[PDB]
Amino acid sequence: GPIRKVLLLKEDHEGLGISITGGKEHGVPILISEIHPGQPADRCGGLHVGDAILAVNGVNLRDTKHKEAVTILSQQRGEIEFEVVYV
Amino acid sequence: RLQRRRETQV
């Protein structure tokens, strides 16, 4: 699939509005498993269930354990770039 | 095996 770079905007009190699965120990990419209605990922309109998150704000998440990916994702603020591909 | 997905809301 083609890589897309997608901007998500959120305020600090918000989460990203996604659930993710996967990570290095699981032998699979970080994948979006749910998009939460009204939350930032839904609002931006460019992130979908089944998208792999390859990177966020230039942090490579292709070879990172689940929890470390969660932590990096959870530290992002403001306008946040997702590098994704539908697999 | 424990029946649980690895899934986190973030």
Residue in B closest to A67 by C-alpha: B8
Range of the domain at A75: 1-87
Provide the shortest C-alpha distance from residue B5 to chain A (in Å): 8
Pairwise CA distance, residues A38 & A78, whole Å: 16
Way it was determined: X-ray
List the resolution, Å. Answer: 1.3
Burial pattern B1-10, b for ≥16 Cβ within 10 A else e, equals eeeeeeebeb
CATH, residue A1: 2.30.42.10
A28 burial via Cβ count (<10 Å: 0-12, 13-18, 19+): middle
Structural domain count, chain A: 1
CB atoms inside a 10 Å sphere around CB A74: 11
Copy the structure tokens of residue A35. 């998009």
Question: Quick check: B8 and A70 CB within 8 A?
Answer: yes
